[PDB]
Amino acid sequence: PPYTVVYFPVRGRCAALRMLLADQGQSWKEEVVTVETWQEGSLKASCLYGQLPKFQDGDLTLYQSNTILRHLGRTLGLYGKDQQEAALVDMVNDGVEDLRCKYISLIYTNYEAGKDDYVKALPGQLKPFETLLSQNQGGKTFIVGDQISFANYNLLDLLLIHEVLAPGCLDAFPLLSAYVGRLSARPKLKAFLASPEYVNLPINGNGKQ
Amino acid sequence: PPYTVVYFPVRGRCAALRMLLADQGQSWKEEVVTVETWQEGSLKASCLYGQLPKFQDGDLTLYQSNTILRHLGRTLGLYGKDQQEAALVDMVNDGVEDLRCKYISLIYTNYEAGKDDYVKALPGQLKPFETLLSQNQGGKTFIVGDQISFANYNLLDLLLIHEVLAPGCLDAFPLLSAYVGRLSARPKLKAFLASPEYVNLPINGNGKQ
Numbered sequence: 001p002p003y004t005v006v007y008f009p010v011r012g013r014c015a016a017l018r019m020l021l022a023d024q025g026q027s028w029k030e031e032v033v034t035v036e037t038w039q040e041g042s043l044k045a046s047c048l049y050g051q052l053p054k055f056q057d058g059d060l061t062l063y064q065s066n067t068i069l070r071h072l073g074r075t076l077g078l079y080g081k082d083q084q085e086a087a088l089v090d091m092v093n094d095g096v097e098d099l100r101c102k103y104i105s106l107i108y109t110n111y112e113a114g115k116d117d118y119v120k121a122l123p124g125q126l127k128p129f130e131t132l133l134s135q136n137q138g139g140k141t142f143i144v145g146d147q148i149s150f151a152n153y154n155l156l157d158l159l160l161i162h163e164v165l166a167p168g169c170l171d172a173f174p175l176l177s178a179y180v181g182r183l184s185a186r187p188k189l190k191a192f193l194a195s196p197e198y199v200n201l202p203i204n205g206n207g208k209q
Numbered sequence: 210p211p212y213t214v215v216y217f218p219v220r221g222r223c224a225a226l227r228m229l230l231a232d233q234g235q236s237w238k239e240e241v242v243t244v245e246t247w248q249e250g251s252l253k254a255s256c257l258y259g260q261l262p263k264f265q266d267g268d269l270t271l272y273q274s275n276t277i278l279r280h281l282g283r284t285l286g287l288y289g290k291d292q293q294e295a296a297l298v299d300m301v302n303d304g305v306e307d308l309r310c311k312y313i314s315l316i317y318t319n320y321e322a323g324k325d326d327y328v329k330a331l332p333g334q335l336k337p338f339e340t341l342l343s344q345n346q347g348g349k350t351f352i353v354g355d356q357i358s359f360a361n362y363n364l365l366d367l368l369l370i371h372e373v374l375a376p377g378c379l380d381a382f383p384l385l386s387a388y389v390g391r392l393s394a395r396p397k398l399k400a401f402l403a404s405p406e407y408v409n410l411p412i413n414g415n416g417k418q
């Protein structure tokens with residue numbers, strides 16, 4: 001630290017890392033970039049991959065939402081108890097990222113025409129995470145092992161936004177349903193999730209959800 | 210170990226991890242899955258995300274190509290010299306993954322119609338890695354620090370397959386070019402890249418490259 005997240009005024013790909021920071025009792029600065037400012041072009045040209053989020057941790061500048069999640073997970077000890085759990089943590093997060101990418105595609109490129117098929121395919125897309133839960137302490141703790149690795153925050157966000165896209169999409173999945181309830185009840189996260197800086201931010205940048 | 214990769218008969222998403230294993234002098238088994246066997250359905254159903262590669266390391270079963278790369282990077286000490294380089298390694302690999310996803314989209318969903326635009330956009334997609342090179346000992350070593358982190362193998366594969374797609378695409382990028390020549394020359398890796406088990410596999414599964 002100090003931590004600074006530079007991003008558009010949406011939850012988007014900063015939602016998970018924000019929940020992580022808040023739940024772990026960290027402080028940070030929100031640098032809000034408006035689409036107007038973004039169109040000016042100077043900031044974009046300075047971003048390694050021409051995109052946000054941009055993350056500052058002291059004198060370290062990072063890009064890539066999952067790089068930030070892994071960085072935070074690594075430095076705060078939320079990356080598994082050993083090399084094996086760590087790999088499983090990656091496997092979960094890579095799974096979360098795959099589905100987030102299809103979600104983002106639906107939202108921004110084909111929402112009207114594609115929503116039905118997407119919702120049909122959703123159960124098969126969620127089953128893996130229910131299954132991971134079923135294989136770890138009866139799904140009563142976290143996605144991997146008994147500590148709250150960074151992948152949980154990313155998974156939690158993926159689940160929450162899919163409840164908005166397709167209400168009831170977790171009804172057929174007891175472990176995922178209870179998982180979201182439990183994690184969302186953690187004191188600091190609950191408070192964060194209920195705050196204006198979260199609630200009054202749209203999930204995506206195009207008005208759809 | 211022992212290491213086993215379960216995959217279709219293509220370079221695809223296993224090319225980089227294979228190069229890594231070969232360059233690092235590791236031994237592994239290839240279990241080839243034909244599309245015929247895949248359509249039978251049983252293996253797919255047993256895969257966490259219904260996809261390959263599947264990776265066996267002793268009694269640990271992993272899925273997700275990048276999870277496998279990070280697993281080998283972590284257990285073989287090819288993941289930066291400290292927490293800070295590790296973050297940069299991730300930032301590189303996430304960038305590689307983003308472009309690989311676009312490459313894969315082109316190949317399998319829009320090759321004929323999309324190629325020309327994609328190749329036009331390619332220079333902008335490659336510059337970031339040239340920029341990273343120029344900020345690390347003049348690009349005379351590796352993509353991050355002076356050790357060959359796993360991310361290097363993924364970047365090398367990405368560059369190699371794009372050279373097939375758009376010959377000369379690295380001519381505008383002296384650092385990337387020299388980087389490719391340099392890594393490709395590494396003895397064990399050089400031998401691998403020229404061996405039948407690499408050369409006689411197509412880059413992709415639909416015969417396009």
Ligand SMILES: N[C@@H](CCC(=O)N[C@@H](CS)C(=O)NCC(=O)O)C(=O)O
Nearest residue numbers: 012013050051052053064065066307
């Ligand atoms: N792989 C990147 C993707 C970043 C990304 O898609 N950023 C979008 C907003 S979520 C952006 O900056 N769009 C504006 C632009 O591309 O000019 C990550 O995970 O951070």
Ligand SMILES: N[C@@H](CCC(=O)N[C@@H](CS)C(=O)NCC(=O)O)C(=O)O
Nearest residue numbers: 098221222259260261262273274275
């Ligand atoms: N995110 C996964 C993607 C895996 C993937 O796309 N696998 C393809 C082959 S490259 C597959 O199994 N296709 C068959 C199917 O989906 O049934 C990774 O990086 O490993």
